[PDB]
Each structure stands twice: as structure tokens, then as C-alpha cells.
Amino acid sequence: PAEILNGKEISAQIRARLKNQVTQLKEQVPGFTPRLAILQVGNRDDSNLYINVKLKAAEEIGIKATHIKLPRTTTESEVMKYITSLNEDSTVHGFLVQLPLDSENSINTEEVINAIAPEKDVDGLTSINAGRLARGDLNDCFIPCTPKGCLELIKETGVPIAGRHAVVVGRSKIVGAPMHDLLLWNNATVTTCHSKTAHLDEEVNKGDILVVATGQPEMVKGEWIKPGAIVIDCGINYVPKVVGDVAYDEAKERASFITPVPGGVGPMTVAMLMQSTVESAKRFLE
Amino acid sequence: PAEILNGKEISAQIRARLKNQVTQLKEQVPGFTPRLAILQVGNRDDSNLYINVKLKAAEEIGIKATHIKLPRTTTESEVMKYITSLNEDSTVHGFLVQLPLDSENSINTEEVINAIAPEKDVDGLTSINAGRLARGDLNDCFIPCTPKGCLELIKETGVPIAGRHAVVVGRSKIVGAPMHDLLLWNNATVTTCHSKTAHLDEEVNKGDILVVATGQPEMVKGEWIKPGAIVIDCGINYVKVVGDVAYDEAKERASFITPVPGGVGPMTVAMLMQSTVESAKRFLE
Ligand SMILES: NC(=O)c1ccc[n+]([C@@H]2O[C@H](COP(=O)([O-])OP(=O)(O)OC[C@H]3O[C@@H](n4cnc5c(N)ncnc54)[C@H](OP(=O)(O)O)[C@@H]3O)[C@@H](O)[C@H]2O)c1
Ligand SMILES: NC(=O)c1ccc[n+]([C@@H]2O[C@H](COP(=O)([O-])OP(=O)(O)OC[C@H]3O[C@@H](n4cnc5c(N)ncnc54)[C@H](OP(=O)(O)O)[C@@H]3O)[C@@H](O)[C@H]2O)c1
Ligand SMILES: Nc1nc(N)c(NC(=O)Nc2ccc(C(=O)N[C@@H](CCc3nnn[nH]3)C(=O)O)cc2Cl)c(=O)[nH]1
Ligand SMILES: Nc1nc(N)c(NC(=O)Nc2ccc(C(=O)N[C@@H](CCc3nnn[nH]3)C(=O)O)cc2Cl)c(=O)[nH]1
């Protein structure tokens, strides 16, 4: 049986560290707090929940986090007025737009995301930041939070990455594609799969490291896992109960390490957002 | 044995179609011509070779091509002066900095490259253009010219790319990394290799589509090639000129294969010409 990567536990350690950093930062420079702003369009149930989790992690740490919720009938111009405003407000060190937008009108997600100043793009979602990570310039940029938490979960096994074959399943802007670059520049040989991959099961079996962000409940079967694989599950799926993208029961019999859902990648994502936010508050002082 | 992919023939076709497009644009827009500029630093011989090749091609198509060659000792602040003038000059549609910079002073290639206006980065080397391609927004940007020509060559086989396993060997900013992005948003399943990969031979053998950009002459033996594979060799290695793949034994197993030279090479030059014509057309509107 595989060792559980206790995400709920591991993130607590990160947030406690982040708190001591923030508390020390207000005692070293008095009258200064990290300031985060999350922008939301519409009223998605899952978005409302994830936003609240992040607000809570920010309260516990010492981060002043605002939440702005625009209605569904919001126009793309209206959302730019908020982005413009947050870019130019020097008290705001990082901000993010929760995705996907829930708007009845037609909003160019890319145009909006890309109006964020790269030095506040704590979610690593601008083309500017994506281009650095996509080209290996990893200390110049914000790296998306879920890949960030995923990488830390991998290192917690102590198995070196470099020289190992990693299979990423899914190529999305927020998880799969940045996940691919992080593994590649940690010198894994990486294979990206997506919805058009033939013989997905044969590919998955090649993975020493296996990261799954498909949004397809328990679609990756345990028989597919390479024996002894490190298995990272990003899935959050609400079913007749919360499951992930990997069939957790069968896969734990073949993995050497596995993330549970919930309690795995989830808390790790929120912690790395908190970390990135602190990191941009420091860079602001310099 | 494998059908040979002819870059000389296919690129000569492309340059010709470019030519006629420029001719018709000049007819409709009297006195308007596409304008490229090639910045160089240092006096590397190979760079002078390839820069001439591009200048000739642009003169063939009717693209006005200027070549500025800064000395091996320039300062970073110097190249920024030129880069800024090129950015501000409205009669220049695109421009590029031949790489690698040959300088005595340590000069940040990244800061140099990222001062280029994205609207003129016909080489697709700016971080803004790299992140558009690397996240699937392919209309937004200039794709780098070599991956553009390898994609054109693969499509000359007529076998759709989707659902196929592609193995990209090499991860450089100029060939390897953008090649993975292009194949992935052509819906291939893509495996990316590099100098830390273990068992290169077994990864290569997975490749329905195989693109090699190592700069390690003939290092990919042809006994690793998956039988029937489409093989793209980006190498140019003086020893004569050979590629990154063992051409002889590869040709026996491939279904298609590019010769070194006259494979990717002329396609690279032709794709930069096409991107330049692209910049000019957009400029008019
Ligand atoms: N903290 C976290 O746990 C976290 C954070 C955010 C999201 N996630 C989770 O990750 C999952 C995916 O989110 P996302 O942002 O990546 O969503 P998405 O935009 O729907 O991405 C899904 C990806 O999976 C691929 N895919 C879909 N069906 C597939 C199949 N049958 N076989 C192979 N590949 C398939 C898609 O390929 P195509 O591009 O061809 O469609 C796409 O790249 C969700 O469960 C989400 O909750 C992780
Ligand atoms: N028009 C054309 O045909 C054209 C265009 C451009 C380039 N080229 C040719 O392409 C070749 C590569 O150029 P480049 O820009 O990619 O140069 P580079 O910066 O040296 O890139 C070489 C790449 O090969 C990878 N690699 C994989 N296996 C390797 C091994 N066993 N030994 C060494 N490297 C290995 C390296 O991975 P690491 O990152 O770990 O080093 C690296 O990413 C050269 O021969 C060049 O002349 C020609
Ligand atoms: N800009 C932008 N837009 C986006 N959409 C995202 N993605 C995102 O926020 N993801 C996200 C964040 C936190 C959790 C979490 O806290 N997970 C816990 C508890 C879940 C649970 N549910 N029921 N019981 N527990 C667990 O999984 O254990 C889960 C997820 Cl998916 C983004 O990151 N940036
Ligand atoms: N910004 C920037 N910087 C860069 N360094 C590059 N790279 C680049 O230009 N490469 C390049 C360009 C053209 C050729 C070519 O014309 N090949 C011919 C003849 C070769 C030959 N040599 N000796 N004998 N034959 C053939 O292969 O047929 C070959 C190469 Cl490597 C870039 O693209 N953009």
C-alpha cells in the first residue's frame, strides 16, 4: 500500500511558517501588512467555497485579503475598471481573478487575465509569467499555485525528480500546462496527455510521477498506474461525496505515494497562494 | 525506405507565394513595402552565414532587410538604444536579434530579447509571445520560425498530427520548447527529452513524430526510430554538414525524413519571411 501524502497536514506547516514571516514582517517594518485581492464574477458554488478557504488561510496567516464579487450581468469593461484600479493601488501587493468567470455576457477571459500587472499576478496566469516558466526562467516569475503545491507534494516523498518520467494528464492554463513546465525544468522527462490522447491507459503506465487534472471523476484507473508510482490527484468532483480524478482505492495498491481527495492538492494550492502573496509583499518593500 | 521531405522545394514554393503576396500588396498600397531588421552582436561566422541567407531570401520576396552589426564589445545599454529605435521606428514591421550574442561584456540575453516590441518579434522570442503559444492562444502571437517550419514539414506527409505520439528531443528557447507547444496544440501527445533524460533510445522509440534539436551530431541513432516514424532533424553540425539524427539508418525505418542540409534550414528562413509579411499586413490596418 502507498504512503499517503497528507496535504492537510503539510500545508499547516507552511501556513504556520508564513504566519511567523508575516508577524516578523510587521515587527521589522511597523504598519505594513500583505494585501491580497480576489476578484469574482458571478456566484458559482465551488468558486464561493474556494474563495472562502483562501480568505481563511489569509486570516490565519496575517494577510489582509479582500473579496470583490461582481454580478453575473457584469460587462468586460466593468471588470477592467477593477483590474486597472487594483494595478495602480500601491497598497495591493497581489490580486487574482477566480476562474472560470460566471457571466451572462461575453467576457474575453484572456484579455482580462492579461490586464493584471505581472508583479501582482500571484496566480501566475498572465502570458508574461507563463512565458518565463514555459521557457525555464523560473526565478523571474510567479508559478501557478496548484503546480506549486503539486511540486512540493512530490518533494515530500524525497524521491529525486530529475531523470524520472512524469506523465501529466490534462493541459489546462491553470493546472496541466504549467504543471508540465515545472516538471520539465526540474529535469523530469515529461509526457503531456489530453482529451485526444490515444490509448491513455498505456501512456499513464509509463508514469513514475503521475499528475492528473482532468475534471473526470475516478477516470484514471489503478490498473493503469505504474507499480511504485508517485500519484498526484488534482481532481475535485462532486458525486452521489468528494472524489478525485484517480480511482483512489485501486491506485493506492500500486502507488508508492498517493494524495487523498480531499485533503491533498487542495490545501497545498491555497498555501502556495499565501506564500506567493507574502513573497510579493517582500519584493514590494525592495 | 522513407520519402524525403524537401525543404529546398517546399521552401522555394513558400518564398514564391510570399513574393506574389508582396507584389499584390504593393499594387493595392502604392509605395508600401514590408521591412525587416536583423540586429547582430559580435562577429560569429555561423551567424554571418545564416544572416546572409535571410537577407537574400528577403530580397527575393521583395522584403527590405537591414542588417545592423554591433561590435563584440558593445554594452547592454547600447543594444537597448538600437532595440528602442527599432521599436519606435514605424517603417519597421518586424525585427530580430540573431542569437547567441557574441559579447565581451556579460549581457542579459533575456532582457535584450524582452525589450523587443511583441508586435515586431517576428522570431517569437519575447516572453509575451512564448506564453501565448505555451498556453494555446496561437492567434495572439508570432510562433518561432523553426518550429513553424517543422510543423509545415510534418504536414507535408498528409498524416494528421492529432492523437499521435510526438517526441521532442531538446528544450531550448528557440527550437525544442516551442516545438512541444506547437505539437501539443496540434493535439499530439508530446514527450519532451533533454540531457537529463534516462534511456533516450526508449523515449525516441515512442515517437510517431520525432523532432531532434540537440546540436549533438548524429547522436540519435536510427535503430531507436519507431518504424514508420516521421523524422524532423533540426541539427546543423559541421564535422561537411550533418544533423542531430543518424541519417542513414534512420532513412531505412522512417516513413518521412528531412535531409541535413536542405531540410528545416530553408524552411526556417521562409517562415521568418512569412511572419514578416504578416507584420506588414497587420500594420496597414
Ligand atoms: N487545488 C486543486 O486541486 C486544483 C485547482 C484547480 C483545479 N484542479 C482540479 O483539476 C481538474 C481539472 O481542472 P482544469 O482547470 O484542468 O480543468 P479543464 O480546463 O477542464 O482541464 C481539463 C483537462 O483534462 C483533459 N481531459 C479531459 N478529459 C480527458 C480524458 N478523458 N482523457 C484525458 N484528458 C482529458 C483536457 O484535455 P483537453 O484540453 O483536450 O480538453 C484538459 O486539458 C478539476 O477536477 C479541478 O478541480 C486542481
Ligand atoms: N534551421 C535549422 O535547421 C536550425 C535552427 C535552429 C537550430 N538548429 C540546430 O539545432 C541544434 C540544437 O540547437 P539549439 O538551439 O536547440 O541549441 P541548445 O541550446 O544547445 O539546445 C540543445 C538541447 O538539446 C537537449 N539535449 C537532449 N539530449 C541531449 C544530449 N544527449 N546531449 C546534449 N543535449 C541534449 C538539451 O537539453 P538541456 O536543456 O538539458 O541541455 C538542450 O535543450 C543545433 O545543431 C543547431 O545548429 C538549426
Ligand atoms: N484564479 C483561479 N481560479 C481558480 N478556479 C483556481 N482554482 C482553485 O482555486 N482551486 C481550489 C482551491 C482550493 C481548494 C480546497 O480548499 N480543497 C480542499 C477542500 C475542498 C473540499 N470540498 N469538499 N470537501 N473538501 C481539498 O481538496 O481537500 C480546491 C480547489 Cl480545486 C485558482 O487557483 N485560481
Ligand atoms: N533570433 C534567431 N537566432 C538564431 N540563432 C536563429 N537560428 C537560425 O537562424 N538558424 C539557421 C538559419 C538558417 C539556416 C540555413 O539556411 N540552413 C541551410 C544551409 C545551412 C548550411 N550551412 N552550411 N552548409 N549548409 C540548410 O540547412 O539547407 C540554418 C540555421 Cl541553423 C533564429 O532563427 N533566430
Numbering used by the authors:
A (entry chain B): 3 to 242, 251 to 296
B (entry chain A): 3 to 241, 251 to 296
Sentences from the paper on this structure:
In contrast, compound 16a and 16g, featuring 1H-tetrazole moiety substitution at the γ-carboxylic acid of glutamic acid, exhibited potent inhibition against MTHFD1. In comparison with the structure of MTHFD1/16e, the structure of MTHFD1/16g revealed that the 1H-tetrazole moiety shifted toward β strand h1 and was hydrogen bonded with Tyr240. Moreover, the larger size of the 1H-tetrazole moiety relative to the carboxylic acid group, in conjunction with its interaction with Tyr240, promoted a movement toward β strand h1 and therefore formed van der Waals interactions with Val252 and Leu51. These structural changes facilitated an interaction network that increased the binding affinity of 16g with MTHFD1. As a result, 16g demonstrated potent inhibitory effects on MTHFD1, hence exhibiting reduced selectivity toward MTHFD2. The superimposition of MTHFD1/16g and MTHFD2/16g revealed that the triaminopyrimidine headgroup, urea linker, and central phenyl ring of compound 16g aligned well in both structures. The important interactions between the headgroup and urea linker of 16g with residues Val131, Gln132, Leu133, Asp155, and Lys88 in MTHFD2 were retained in MTHFD1, where they corresponded to Val99, Gln100, Leu101, Asp125, and Lys56. The differences between these two structures were attributed to the residue substitutions from Ser83 and Asn87 in MTHFD2 to Leu51 and Val55 in MTHFD1. These hydrophobic residue replacements in MTHFD1 prevented the formation of hydrogen bonds with the amide or 1H-tetrazole moiety of 16g. Instead, a hydrogen bond was formed between the 1H-tetrazole moiety and Tyr240 in MTHFD1.
